[PDB]
Design a protein around this ligand. Structure first.
Ligand code: NAD
Ligand code: NAD
Ligand code: NAD
Ligand code: NAD
Ligand code: ZN
Ligand code: ZN
Ligand code: ZN
Ligand code: ZN
Ligand code: ZN
Ligand code: ZN
Ligand code: ZN
Ligand code: ZN
Lengths: 345, 345, 345, 345
């Protein structure tokens, strides 16, 4: 009754399939999906052994989502049919201390209740239609291009959160290091320019990507090679960086992060590369904080979208069809996407 | 020409000795020492191999210091002879971004210039007289008992700093875990009660010390045994603690710290136990920050002293003479001091 | 079909009346009311001319509310019948930037939509039953006495908000002035002791109330007479107070507030006494901020309730019956309530 | 023995005069002045009646100052002869809580001690040489053009301070209104773009100045006429601005400020136009804070200078000679300076 992209066999690839069109239960909303982002966390999931995977088969993929409100469920009010909306992804219980703050990303009782985001447990966005649990997980778009902006629901939000979190320890005139100019990283760079006073240093591996980073306003773009630590030291007295945003998060990049963060600095480990930064005396410098943030707050999403409208940040997009989505995943794992892959069905 | 307590042979014990009385150079001040604190960092130094030790022999010990201003050096103004003052210990360059903020503890150029605190590089406080480099490293006492308060220069300041740093992520009504109710820990407990809204949980090993902790306003005092993680979980939904202050900082206590900090929480690794908390995804929880703070800011010292005057915090003191100082160090390493050892010469 | 306290004639007194028992529409909840607070804002409303009054006649009064969940409306989930809950009063649209943050008190689109709190536009709490618009405006009590705590929904929340807002400019060891030790003021005092490091100075007019203030932990209790400014100056060098909380907010108390706030200080004008503080150069001191806060955030309510459970704050209550409510209002305007008047039906 | 610009007769104009070249006392430094800013506060002073003026005659003017260190005073170390430095102007006692923080602008004991800034009490910068009281009031320039940057010591610092102070209540994607695009205002605009996520709205009276404002990155430039309030309302839903920076501060501009600040917003009254914003219930909106900041912190100066080096902000300068300084003051009061008047002797 509708088409969708699903993960169905452990270790297998994602398939386009036919499945029922869902109806909105009470309190719920269904969207006609205008755009759908592909994130490298979607990759990480599909290469897990059968034992570590916990989202059930089948699973409709894709947790960056925008659309137009197709049908309203029982009792729902707040949004009309026809409204352009983005999906706030990191769903939570709505009532705990964090949720009440808007920070459903840090919900203290969601693992317990088995609340899961769309595309990471609940039916996701890579489909012609998707359901959203509740009205508070929708954010108005007005007249922002869904394709241009949908990726801000994660690729923007997540580093924005991490950056906004870091401005306490990142004074204007400071220096910030972004490791990885990928989907998040390339937005991370723009955001850092928009709202910190920092001198942004980007690091990636392909020159392709360094040029993009520099084009997106990075004051410096460097290879994350064995000379990277030295150059950053050079560029910052011998003081190091006030903030470091590791959007790779592997043991190598984390090691780099430790060796360059300044006294009293901060490291946001944003990417999931399987590493851990050993934080402590004579490991991390004095006053140096370390954190593995996760996604962002409800308000923070609205703030990122408001920045898009202002023209202070954008997603570099590479467009695909619903059918091309499996190919786009192969491109993403190959590392030959420029920015964000966005599927339009 | 005056008596003092010094460290002179690697691996040896501290000796009372006769040495010259120092004169204040230009910009400097000499104090007639009214009280002098003994900290377990003084211990840590003296058990280092010859290669890792870098403060020179001989070294006058003691970095908690108060007194009356004996003689003024050339050109000095700001304080008169006769003024009761405490010593702000973590000396810095005075001009960098941190120093200008008052945070000479996080001075970016002090290792370079070879600036060292009194008792950890420069002549310390365990003497009849000591020199202070500059007037900005003195804080008025008015009429606070030097013996009662001197330890607030470190035993208070350091956890105060760490606590004040944590209140962002420690909401009133939250829960805070203090591992170690020693010199710092027993002040840490009082401070947490004074200025957080938290339910303080203390952890130590002797029942002696738990009783003191509970007497000093800890809502709970627990053994840091293998049931400690469970009890903390029990006491906090299954949510864990918003803040954890490890005043031991060994690999065991750090492991405990990781297993009990809440989603979005913070761990201040205050003690130097040789461990490191492996911070990262699936190691630390989501949003969980980790930090190894060091001492505190100039303003923060004045704030702690203002709390003493208000009667909102005190040091439990165990008094000694200059001659008894070697014995007091043995007691401290034995772990049979109640609070802080303060020498009066 | 049920009894309630209502305001029905402009310039008239509140009457106990019989009215229909309400049923919960979809998304709504009905409570069996266990306790109901009386606030001096309820007074302010009833002495307005016909033209300035805008809540309609009749109006069920009372915006401090607790109870047990009687009946669930269509589609509602989140809370069961039988759950002990408090009402978060300052209702908002739920979707704007403020609301998403939890700060429905500062909702940017609520005047437009005509959203009104219970007891200040919607049917209130002084009844055997009341309706709440949505589940997010309920907060679990667990096993807190509804009578002991209900007033924390406003009498606690409002000054807590104002205090928490002020801690940026109120360092531990500072001085805070609370003008008015009434319903809010007497909780304000306790909160200031719980979570600031401040030396609290209370000011009222009856010695009755000063004694209560001092009993509740005020370091000083003074008459708000013509010597009040002088004494505060005396007590704080000649520096004045870092924070001032005017819980009266009349032109006299506001004038006092201006003349005693310190350089870089803050004034929270909490009470509605018809005055305005003229903020500006050579009126307010340099760096001195001034604000008229309103109520508090959703999370902030939960935080205050968590403080009650911890035993760090309580409401001094004076109990009444539903029938005695008109008399209790007369007592409140007469200024001969000790703390908060709470009606139990 | 050297030339200087002085104010010598009440109600009279500033004269170029010959006076002794000063020698540095102990702790002091003398600068060979490379550039010297002219601020409209220099104007405000000279039009005061004899009774309200308190800086003595004669007075060397000019409180924006840069130079090269000519001669060192007794005992001074920290800076060598030949070092390029800027002067941190708002001198304070160095020891109080504020000063220790770096915030000598909010020094609690400076009026008492009669400490006065250069150009506003002490010999100023409009001379061939000037003295600075102490080394901590100098900030390294490295190789920034003194003429290009000197005005950042006030024209930058002051609004930077006010802006940095406001970012709590100014979320990215918000809207900020800068009233007055003059000396401060034109830097204010750039700073707001550098480090807030805000949509900047500038307001001035000459189209000349609006064009400059828009050229300097203002998203909108409007006449501060009777339609100004309406347009701002239009541009921001009907919500108003999160932040408003009144760099005029007259009763008219303050009235505008009140009528456009949003619920929960902030107004920084930066300019000295003789007005006062009546802050209170039904005057200012709910949660709306109001403040008259003064200058900035020591660290904040270094941060602004670091932004200059980064190329994120600059002063639009109009250069003059020492002799032309009286004419430049006439131009400034006439309102026909474009940016900042900087004298080079
Ligand atoms: N914390 C969270 O909540 C969260 C949310 C979303 C994504 N993520 C994670 O962030 C990471 C990046 O996601 P993405 O969508 O940007 O992926 P992406 O494939 O779009 O981009 C990855 C980028 O990192 C670069 N890179 C790889 N190794 C590097 C190294 N050693 N040094 C420097 N650069 C290197 C690649 O060349 C590429 O530019 C992933 O691990 C993903 O799981 C985390
Ligand atoms: N970060 C800094 O700048 C800084 C400053 C001063 C001191 N310190 C460090 O803080 C630590 C404590 O200093 P102190 O002066 O309080 O020492 P102390 O000897 O006075 O107190 C130590 C306390 O920890 C307890 N303890 C030991 N092992 C424990 C465990 N596994 N679980 C729970 N409690 C345990 C002891 O019984 C004792 O009560 C030291 O390592 C010291 O070096 C750090
Ligand atoms: N900002 C908000 O959202 C908000 C919320 C609730 C209440 N309020 C306001 O707070 C104020 C107090 O409310 P309440 O319930 O505590 O009233 P209350 O009658 O319980 O207490 C008022 C107290 O102020 C004292 N007082 C009166 N004049 C004084 C003066 N000149 N100096 C010092 N003390 C004086 C009285 O003796 C009494 O102790 C009211 O104006 C109310 O409208 C504001
Ligand atoms: N708070 C402080 O510490 C501090 C420090 C320095 C200067 N100031 C004050 O800031 C103000 C501005 O200083 P400046 O050096 O930029 O002066 P300036 O003469 O360089 O600029 C003033 C600008 O305001 C504009 N203006 C005048 N009336 C206006 C109105 N009604 N609406 C909009 N714009 C208007 C003028 O056209 C001009 O562009 C002065 O009052 C000065 O005293 C305050
Ligand atoms: Zn993702
Ligand atoms: Zn939750
Ligand atoms: Zn120590
Ligand atoms: Zn330094
Ligand atoms: Zn009320
Ligand atoms: Zn709202
Ligand atoms: Zn000026
Ligand atoms: Zn001072």
């Amino acid at each position: 009754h509708m088409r969708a992209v699903q993960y169905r066999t452990i270790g297998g690839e994602p398939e386009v399939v036919e499945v029922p069109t869902p109806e909105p239960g009470p309190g719920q909303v269904r969207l006609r999906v205008t755009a759908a982002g592909l994130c490298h966390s979607d990759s990480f999931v599909m290469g897990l052994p059968a034992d570590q995977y916990t989202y059930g088969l089948p699973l409709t993929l894709g947790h960056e989502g925008a659309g137009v409100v197709d049908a309203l469920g029982d009792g729902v009010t707040g949004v009309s049919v026809g409204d352009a909306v983005a999906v706030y992804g990191p769903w939570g219980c709505g009532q705990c201390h964090a949720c009440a703050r808007g920070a459903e990303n840090y919900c203290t009782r969601a693992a317990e209740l088995g609340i899961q985001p769309p595309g990471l447990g609940s039916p996701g966005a890579l489909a012609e239609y998707m359901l959203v649990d509740d009205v508070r997980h929708l954010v108005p778009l007005g007249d922002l291009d869904p394709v241009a902006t949908v990726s801000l629901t994660d690729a923007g939000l997540t580093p924005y959160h991490a950056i906004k979190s870091s401005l306490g320890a990142l004074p204007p005139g400071g220096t910030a290091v972004v490791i990885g100019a990928g989907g998040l990283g390339h937005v991370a760079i723009q955001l850092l320019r928009a709202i910190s006073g920092a001198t942004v240093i980007a690091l990636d591996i392909s020159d392709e990507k360094l040029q993009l980073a520099k084009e997106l306003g990075a004051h410096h773009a460097l290879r994350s090679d064995d000379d990277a630590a030295a150059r950053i030291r050079e560029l910052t007295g011998g003081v190091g960086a006030a903030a470091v945003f590791d959007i790779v998060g592997a043991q190598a990049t984390i090691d780099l992060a430790r060796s360059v963060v300044a006294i009293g600095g901060v490291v946001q480990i944003v990417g999931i590369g399987g590493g851990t930064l050993p934080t402590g005396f004579f490991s991390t410098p004095m006053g140096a904080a370390v954190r593995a943030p996760y996604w962002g707050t409800r308000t923070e999403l609205m703030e990122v979208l408001d920045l898009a409208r202002a023209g202070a940040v954008h997603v570099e997009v590479e467009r695909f069809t619903l059918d091309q989505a499996p190919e786009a995943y192969r491109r993403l794992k190959a590392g030959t996407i420029r920015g964000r892959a966005v599927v339009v069905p």
